Amino acid sequence: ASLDPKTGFPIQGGSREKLCGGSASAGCQPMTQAASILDKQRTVLAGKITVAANKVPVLTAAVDKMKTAKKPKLDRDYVLRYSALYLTTLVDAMEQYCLRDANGAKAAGGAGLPKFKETLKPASSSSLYSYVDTVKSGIAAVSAAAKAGDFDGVNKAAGDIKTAADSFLSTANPPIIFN
Amino acid sequence: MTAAYLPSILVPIIGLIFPGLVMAFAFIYIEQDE
């Protein structure tokens, strides 16, 4: 029913073990599954978003410890290495969910292997692309604060990422597929 | 730790029952005439 905070795997059973012939009833058991391959890719992407967003307070809590110290330095390396790893992973996954949400099944491999000439609609024209823009601006803020030495700047910017990612999930309501 | 129950299940089995069974069955194999 939701995605595990740290693992990003479908957690709740959804209380759906229906064998139900005739109407499939989206029986979570395989061969009774009503979910498309596209829905399953969407749940994987949403799981990635959950891992990244739950990791966002780790940066917030680490930055708070840094500021509290006897002498404060704002480890630019930690802040950047968080942004290079966790934060970029968030943006790319959010972009991919938008791509599937807008072009449709073509992004699921209908058009073939990922190519330099993607023959589908881009990640734009999505109602949730605005949230991707928020995270992108926040990544820039996180880097800018780290270069400047602003402890408060990193914390606020990470909070902006957390709100934006949570907002993305709520509007999308990603299908929870356990198969 | 995820699936944190696994070491408390698998370590006694691997460390006690698994050698206890291979020693028991190896002894039978090495002490049989046929």
Partner: peptide, 30 residues
Amino acid sequence: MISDTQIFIALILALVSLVLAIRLGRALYQ
């Protein structure tokens, strides 16, 4: 992090390796 289901996938595939290891060992033993 790793889910428990992911651990269970590894236990399935390592079980498949245990079955193949027995068969290779029995073939070597003749």
